[PDB]
RNA sequence: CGGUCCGGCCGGGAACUCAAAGGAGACUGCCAGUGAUAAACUGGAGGAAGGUGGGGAUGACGUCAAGUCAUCAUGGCCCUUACGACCAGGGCUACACACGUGCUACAAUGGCGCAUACAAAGAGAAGCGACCUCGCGAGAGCAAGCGGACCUCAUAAAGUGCGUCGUAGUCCGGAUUGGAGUCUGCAACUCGACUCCAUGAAGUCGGAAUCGCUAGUAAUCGUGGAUCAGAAUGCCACGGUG
């Protein structure tokens, strides 16, 4: 089997990518497991916004790292290579786990 | 009820009343009674005098009242005579271990000394 | 420091990021330096070109720089003359194979970075600042902006008491989160000091 | 303090000077900026001028001065009192 | 034939399964006297069962995760009331009056910048 | 507050007796959010309190509660050159709240060892009508008729 | 920051990467309990002979745009000021003002 | 459901918890009373939520010639064999004193010892580092697993149960100091943190004065992160009890 991990910042841009990567192995291979969502990492940040002296004046940022786990049950011959030849948009990081 | 030179209260338990000895604490009092086979919840009352003789020998293994104060004063006066930084702190009355002297040095400096 | 930056507060709602890539923490800050050096270089190189927004994107360890400009003719030159010259120096800086795409800016009077640089270029050659602010507002409301606010600040006409001035025509709702406020900021390095120029342009509300 | 498994510490440029002055047998004051070097037992009886930030104060080495460092015998802050 | 309800509290999440029986309370494979040592928490898990006269009427199997002693006890009451309305549906007219069907939405407030706690501001001094 | 009269929150009854008032008493005793200890102290002090009296724990608590309830308190108004302590009638909710505060406050000041020993002795004296808590009841009443001219 | 202070910072990265293999060689000797003590004494005297700027604890993470020694963030490589100027113009992907 | 090493562990099961993505939901929308036939207000009705449900972000024109030329940028002035540059050592940590902000206390709603229950939110590759062994201990050795809903940091503490102290400067309090160490780091003297043994100050609730807080709030209890080789009682987050 091939575990595929999709990491992104825009959840619309990963769902645009997640439904895209299903249709490749749905046509070529068989039994795409599902677009199983994982917990989202929220890496917060907090900085002083004044240049010299205001300790109480701050911004609070975050980065939401959206995760998607899609498994492929029966890898055919076209399942590996045609999805390897397939590339996705930037912002999405794909990560295959062969076996 | 008289161990290592000084007396020891009878109404207290065993580990606590041992700590009146200058040189033992709650750790070493457990180390004394374990080597004597004496339970810690008993008092200095209702002890056999043979048990107290066992108690005096275990305390005599370590450094106590008359020895320890001499050793502590010898270590401080060793620093006094060298003139190191720790010696100067010991003789200016200032804190030795690198604490702040700008504020809150009242243990070594005593109470406040007003500017007159 | 009263007002929030209108671009940065709208980044999840109606504004896109100018860099849309992904990396882990191991390779993050090197990319952010790499994104900074090419925006530094291209702004210095395409100064005469009316460049507004340099969008950087890197899939599969290959940078793709999308230059927004009011005229691509000075950016391209002959067909693959200056773009190809600029593509090989990005790859020297980014360390990856590069690619330059050019998205043309229709209606350059309705783009805040172009308007702010037009005010700055006028102020640098010693025009009256109030005349420059009028024409920047009149051109945008004619071309169809629902509201523009411009603002210059400090050492105006060489006066020793620095003050700020601002004009406004049409409605510019800054507190409305779904408002398309095009905001960007320029600086004029005059002989009497530095004059900062801010310009807000309201296009309309995105009804998502 | 330092770990026992690392042993003591001394500058190499100091330790070569100690090795020279033992064999040469000279009692010149050795000016030294190594305030962080532990004194060794072969250093006993030598005038070694430890720096303090401003000048070099000479330190005669005693038997009791072995397990310390040279900076303890060169005080860096001059303080006499407020009144 | 089991009847289910989810109750939630501060950060708790109860899973209550109602079967008709004798009144056997099992929480995380432990008895009620075993699980909640606090007698106040033993009351609130019995309040809707004592609101109606159905202490002896039904057994129940409960799992709960997250939160504290009173937090897990609070979610168990809100799950039993969620499951008894699946059992009868005539009890919503009474359990609303008991204030039980309302999920208490009192989460803890986040610590804010400048403030030492959710609402405690640091000590003020003019001079 | 200035704008509105508020809607007060609902209190649980106690687990042992079902009394709303006794659970209002364990909250006044409670410090630092430790209700479990304050639940134990009240249930230990009221255990020996009914032991000394043979009545119900709920019934004998109210007897000590009856002899510390103030009837008229005063409050500062100061419309002239000095402070006017005007004797204002106290509503029956605050009558019950001031009483339980005074019993707890007197029970802090006793010299007994256990807090349940400090509180059961104070309740047994309040039903006997002595102690600091009824002495606080007197000084409120003594200041009342010493200012009855103001109304 | 100064030009020289940034120049000093680049030198402390190059020297810390130059002798990096040799410093781990000596620390393997000194930390080994199963070693000759004259070697462990020779290793700690050898480690003095290396330049001081070769240590990884010697360089300080400055802002990569301005050289500011304080307010640094390791994920962005910038100080707290230049993070805020970049985050508002959207040069940092996926970074926006949070509220929760 | 079946099976068991009684462990969701293992066949499995997709319900449930949960994880996100999309959507529904609350609008004075309805009912009654008041109101100037209005705005609106009061009440109850359903409902998880009722009138802004709770919390955050969001800070008008301006004010204080407010702050910052030491993040950066920049007009003008100044320095250019020094006001620039390099290195070692020192200092930024001094100490008759005055103030701010905090931490721990002055104990019995507690200290202590044993046993035991319940969290959330995070970080991790020059990193997090199980298990096992050694050490009283901080730690050391060997060393899995992990770029992480998997593994690790990491056993939550307050609590409860039992025993203990029994009002004392105490089995309260922990300063100070001596001795012995560990770890980080070229290097812990000035000037680090931590551990062990010993030491056991002041302090018995605080003058005039003064601060915070309206509900999961104050109070209290632990947890994590940023910075960082190491180095918080600060700061930023998180849940428990309440
Ligand atoms: Mg002692
Ligand atoms: Mg101790
Ligand atoms: Mg603001
Ligand atoms: Mg502050
Ligand atoms: Mg004051
Ligand atoms: Mg202030
Ligand atoms: Mg410079
Ligand atoms: Mg450093
Ligand atoms: Mg109603
Ligand atoms: Mg209603
Ligand atoms: Mg608003
Ligand atoms: Mg000024
Ligand atoms: Mg230097
Ligand atoms: Mg300082
Ligand atoms: Mg960390
Ligand atoms: Mg062991
Ligand atoms: Mg306990
Ligand atoms: Mg006890
Ligand atoms: Mg103690
Ligand atoms: Mg005293
Ligand atoms: Mg006392
Ligand atoms: Mg309020
Ligand atoms: Mg650290
Ligand atoms: Mg809290």
CSV table of C-alpha atoms (C1' of nucleotides) in Angstrom, one decimal, chain H:
chain,number,residue,atom,x,y,z
H,1,C,C1',-19.6,-8.7,17.4
H,2,G,C1',-16.1,-13.5,17.5
H,3,G,C1',-11.1,-14.5,19.6
H,4,U,C1',-7.6,-13.7,23.8
H,5,C,C1',-1.4,-13.3,26.4
H,6,C,C1',-7.4,-9.5,29.5
H,7,G,C1',-4.0,-5.0,26.9
H,8,G,C1',-8.6,-2.3,21.2
H,9,C,C1',-4.8,-6.3,21.9
H,10,C,C1',-6.7,-9.0,17.2
H,11,G,C1',-9.9,-10.5,13.6
H,12,G,C1',-13.0,-6.9,12.8
H,13,G,C1',-16.8,-3.0,13.3
H,14,A,C1',-18.4,1.4,11.6
H,15,A,C1',-21.8,3.2,15.2
H,16,C,C1',-19.7,6.4,19.2
H,17,U,C1',-15.8,9.8,21.1
H,18,C,C1',-12.5,12.5,18.0
H,19,A,C1',-10.2,14.6,13.7
H,20,A,C1',-11.3,18.4,9.9
H,21,A,C1',-14.1,20.1,5.4
H,22,G,C1',-18.9,21.6,3.9
H,23,G,C1',-23.7,22.9,5.7
H,24,A,C1',-27.7,23.9,9.2
H,25,G,C1',-28.7,27.1,13.7
H,26,A,C1',-30.9,32.8,16.6
H,27,C,C1',-33.4,36.6,13.2
H,28,U,C1',-36.8,40.2,18.5
H,29,G,C1',-38.3,35.3,14.1
H,30,C,C1',-42.8,34.0,16.9
H,31,C,C1',-46.6,34.8,21.7
H,32,A,C1',-48.3,38.4,25.3
H,33,G,C1',-48.0,43.4,27.8
H,34,U,C1',-46.1,48.6,27.4
H,35,G,C1',-45.0,52.5,23.8
H,36,A,C1',-46.4,58.0,20.2
H,37,U,C1',-50.8,52.7,15.4
H,38,A,C1',-43.4,53.9,15.6
H,39,A,C1',-38.5,52.9,17.3
H,40,A,C1',-38.0,50.1,21.2
H,41,C,C1',-38.5,47.7,26.1
H,42,U,C1',-40.3,44.0,29.6
H,43,G,C1',-42.0,39.0,30.1
H,44,G,C1',-42.4,33.4,28.1
H,45,A,C1',-42.3,30.1,24.0
H,46,G,C1',-39.3,26.7,21.7
H,47,G,C1',-34.3,25.8,21.6
H,48,A,C1',-27.6,23.6,22.6
H,49,A,C1',-27.5,28.7,22.5
H,50,G,C1',-32.1,34.9,23.2
H,51,G,C1',-31.6,39.6,22.3
H,52,U,C1',-24.1,41.9,21.1
H,53,G,C1',-24.8,33.8,23.5
H,54,G,C1',-19.0,34.0,25.5
H,55,G,C1',-13.9,35.4,24.0
H,56,G,C1',-10.6,37.6,20.4
H,57,A,C1',-9.0,40.4,16.2
H,58,U,C1',-10.6,45.2,14.4
H,59,G,C1',-8.6,51.5,17.5
H,60,A,C1',-12.4,57.6,13.6
H,61,C,C1',-10.5,63.2,13.2
H,62,G,C1',-6.9,64.2,16.3
H,63,U,C1',-4.0,65.1,21.2
H,64,C,C1',0.8,64.9,24.0
H,65,A,C1',7.0,69.0,19.2
H,66,A,C1',4.8,61.5,23.5
H,67,G,C1',8.5,57.2,22.2
H,68,U,C1',12.5,55.3,19.0
H,69,C,C1',18.5,58.7,14.4
H,70,A,C1',20.7,52.0,19.1
H,71,U,C1',16.1,47.3,14.2
H,72,C,C1',16.0,49.7,9.8
H,73,A,C1',15.7,54.1,6.5
H,74,U,C1',17.0,59.4,6.0
H,75,G,C1',18.1,65.6,5.7
H,76,G,C1',21.9,68.3,8.0
H,77,C,C1',26.3,68.3,11.2
H,78,C,C1',30.7,65.7,13.0
H,79,C,C1',35.1,61.7,12.8
H,80,U,C1',38.6,59.9,8.7
H,81,U,C1',46.7,57.5,11.3
H,82,A,C1',40.3,57.8,14.4
H,83,C,C1',34.5,59.0,17.0
H,84,G,C1',36.8,53.6,12.1
H,85,A,C1',38.8,48.3,12.5
H,86,C,C1',41.2,43.6,15.4
H,87,C,C1',42.3,40.8,20.1
H,88,A,C1',42.8,39.5,25.3
H,89,G,C1',41.1,40.6,30.2
H,90,G,C1',37.5,43.4,32.8
H,91,G,C1',32.7,45.7,33.1
H,92,C,C1',27.3,45.7,31.9
H,93,U,C1',26.1,41.4,38.1
H,94,A,C1',29.6,47.1,42.2
H,95,C,C1',26.5,48.7,47.1
H,96,A,C1',25.6,53.1,53.3
H,97,C,C1',20.7,53.5,50.6
H,98,A,C1',15.3,54.9,48.0
H,99,C,C1',11.3,53.0,44.8
H,100,G,C1',8.6,49.8,41.3
H,101,U,C1',7.1,44.8,39.7
H,102,G,C1',7.2,39.8,41.3
H,103,C,C1',8.3,34.8,43.8
H,104,U,C1',8.2,32.0,48.5
H,105,A,C1',6.4,32.4,53.3
H,106,C,C1',4.6,33.4,58.2
H,107,A,C1',1.4,27.0,58.6
H,108,A,C1',-3.2,22.7,61.0
H,109,U,C1',-8.5,24.8,54.9
H,110,G,C1',-1.3,22.9,56.9
H,111,G,C1',3.8,20.4,56.8
H,112,C,C1',5.2,15.2,56.0
H,113,G,C1',5.1,9.9,54.6
H,114,C,C1',2.7,5.9,51.8
H,115,A,C1',-1.1,4.6,48.4
H,116,U,C1',-4.3,6.3,44.4
H,117,A,C1',-7.9,9.3,40.4
H,118,C,C1',-8.8,13.0,36.6
H,119,A,C1',-6.3,17.1,32.0
H,120,A,C1',-5.6,20.4,28.1
H,121,A,C1',-2.2,22.8,24.9
H,122,G,C1',2.4,22.4,22.7
H,123,A,C1',7.8,21.2,20.9
H,124,G,C1',11.1,17.8,18.4
H,125,A,C1',16.7,16.3,13.4
H,126,A,C1',23.7,20.0,15.1
H,127,G,C1',16.7,17.7,17.8
H,128,C,C1',13.1,14.8,21.1
H,129,G,C1',15.3,10.9,23.2
H,130,A,C1',12.0,5.4,25.4
H,131,C,C1',13.5,0.7,27.4
H,132,C,C1',17.6,-1.5,30.2
H,133,U,C1',21.9,-0.8,33.4
H,134,C,C1',24.8,2.3,37.0
H,135,G,C1',24.5,6.3,40.5
H,136,C,C1',21.5,8.6,47.3
H,137,G,C1',21.2,12.4,43.5
H,138,A,C1',21.5,15.9,39.7
H,139,G,C1',23.1,12.5,35.9
H,140,A,C1',26.1,8.7,33.1
H,141,G,C1',26.4,4.4,29.7
H,142,C,C1',24.4,1.5,25.9
H,143,A,C1',20.5,2.7,22.9
H,144,A,C1',15.1,1.9,20.3
H,145,G,C1',11.4,4.9,18.2
H,146,C,C1',10.4,9.5,15.9
H,147,G,C1',10.4,15.3,10.8
H,148,G,C1',5.9,12.9,14.3
H,149,A,C1',-3.3,11.8,15.9
H,150,C,C1',2.1,6.6,15.6
H,151,C,C1',7.6,7.8,18.9
H,152,U,C1',9.7,11.0,22.6
H,153,C,C1',9.8,15.3,25.9
H,154,A,C1',5.9,13.4,29.9
H,155,U,C1',4.5,10.4,36.0
H,156,A,C1',-0.1,16.6,35.6
H,157,A,C1',-0.5,19.0,40.3
H,158,A,C1',-4.2,20.7,43.5
H,159,G,C1',-7.5,16.0,44.9
H,160,U,C1',-8.9,11.5,47.5
H,161,G,C1',-7.5,7.4,51.2
H,162,C,C1',-4.5,6.2,55.4
H,163,G,C1',-0.9,7.5,59.0
H,164,U,C1',1.7,11.5,61.2
H,165,C,C1',2.9,16.1,63.7
H,166,G,C1',-0.6,19.0,67.9
H,167,U,C1',0.5,25.5,68.2
H,168,A,C1',5.8,25.9,69.4
H,169,G,C1',9.8,30.3,65.5
H,170,U,C1',7.6,24.2,65.6
H,171,C,C1',8.4,17.9,61.6
H,172,C,C1',6.2,25.9,59.9
H,173,G,C1',9.6,28.9,57.0
H,174,G,C1',13.5,28.5,53.8
H,175,A,C1',17.4,32.6,53.5
H,176,U,C1',22.6,32.3,54.4
H,177,U,C1',27.0,29.6,54.6
H,178,G,C1',30.5,25.3,54.5
H,179,G,C1',31.7,20.5,52.2
H,180,A,C1',31.0,17.2,48.1
H,181,G,C1',29.2,16.9,43.0
H,182,U,C1',26.7,16.6,38.0
H,183,C,C1',25.9,19.0,33.3
H,184,U,C1',26.5,22.9,29.5
H,185,G,C1',30.4,25.2,27.2
H,186,C,C1',37.6,26.6,24.4
H,187,A,C1',36.4,28.3,29.5
H,188,A,C1',31.5,28.5,35.0
H,189,C,C1',37.1,33.2,39.7
H,190,U,C1',34.6,37.8,39.1
H,191,C,C1',29.7,35.6,36.9
H,192,G,C1',25.6,29.9,35.3
H,193,A,C1',22.0,26.3,36.4
H,194,C,C1',21.1,21.8,39.1
H,195,U,C1',22.1,17.9,42.9
H,196,C,C1',23.7,15.8,47.7
H,197,C,C1',25.2,16.3,52.9
H,198,A,C1',25.3,19.9,56.6
H,199,U,C1',23.5,24.9,58.0
H,200,G,C1',18.4,26.6,59.7
H,201,A,C1',18.2,34.3,59.1
H,202,A,C1',14.1,37.2,58.9
H,203,G,C1',9.1,36.1,59.2
H,204,U,C1',4.0,34.5,63.8
H,205,C,C1',-0.3,38.3,58.3
H,206,G,C1',2.2,43.6,57.8
H,207,G,C1',1.9,51.8,59.4
H,208,A,C1',0.1,55.9,56.5
H,209,A,C1',-1.3,54.3,52.0
H,210,U,C1',-2.8,51.3,47.9
H,211,C,C1',-4.1,47.4,43.6
H,212,G,C1',-6.8,43.7,40.8
H,213,C,C1',-11.4,41.5,39.9
H,214,U,C1',-18.7,40.8,38.1
H,215,A,C1',-18.4,33.9,36.4
H,216,G,C1',-15.6,29.5,34.6
H,217,U,C1',-14.3,35.5,36.7
H,218,A,C1',-11.1,36.3,41.1
H,219,A,C1',-8.5,32.9,44.1
H,220,U,C1',-5.6,28.5,43.8
H,221,C,C1',-3.1,24.2,41.3
H,222,G,C1',0.1,22.1,38.0
H,223,U,C1',1.5,22.0,32.2
H,224,G,C1',3.9,23.9,27.7
H,225,G,C1',6.3,27.2,24.4
H,226,A,C1',9.2,31.3,22.5
H,227,U,C1',14.4,33.2,23.3
H,228,C,C1',18.3,29.5,24.1
H,229,A,C1',25.1,25.6,24.2
H,230,G,C1',23.8,26.4,29.2
H,231,A,C1',21.0,29.9,32.0
H,232,A,C1',13.5,32.4,34.8
H,233,U,C1',10.1,33.6,40.3
H,234,G,C1',9.7,37.2,33.7
H,235,C,C1',6.8,36.8,29.3
H,236,C,C1',3.3,34.1,26.1
H,237,A,C1',-0.1,30.1,26.0
H,238,C,C1',-2.9,25.6,28.4
H,239,G,C1',-6.2,23.0,31.3
H,240,G,C1',-7.8,21.4,36.9
H,241,U,C1',-10.6,23.0,41.2
H,242,G,C1',-13.7,27.0,41.7
